[PDB]
């Protein structure tokens, strides 16, 4: 439940995946569920499914 930098409040959902070598940390905005940023950036070609 993070306050935005402009003053209002918008809930953020942080996703932690622990899958060994496929582990990643991905933050979403919890309303549209688009990836704001990821700890490991993946391409549409390399790891085509679940592109970060």
């Amino acid at each position: 439940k993070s306050r935005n930098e402009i003053g209002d409040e918008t809930v953020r959902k942080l996703y932690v995946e622990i899958m060994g070598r496929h582990s990643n940390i991905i933050l979403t905005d919890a309303a549209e569920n688009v990836i704001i940023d990821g700890l490991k950036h993946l391409s549409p070609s390399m790891n085509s499914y679940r592109t970060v």
Binding site: R3, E5, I6, G7, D8, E9
Partner: protein, 84 residues
Amino acid sequence: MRLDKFLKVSRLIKRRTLAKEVADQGRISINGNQAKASSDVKPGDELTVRFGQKLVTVQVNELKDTTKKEEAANMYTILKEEKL
């Protein structure tokens, strides 16, 4: 000077990007009317900057562009504060 510059030197908003975003989101009014991030201020205006669930209203006294607290807390004068 500009509104975001005045908020930066008056230490109300410590970052110019945050003040620019707040004023571009339509939160700050000068002399009652709404204004953008670049409205020129005069000594003797009534700022109506809106924080998150705050209604801080200050009064302009001087305009100096110094980035030091010795010459910064002498331009804005708080009149009244309203939570909601």
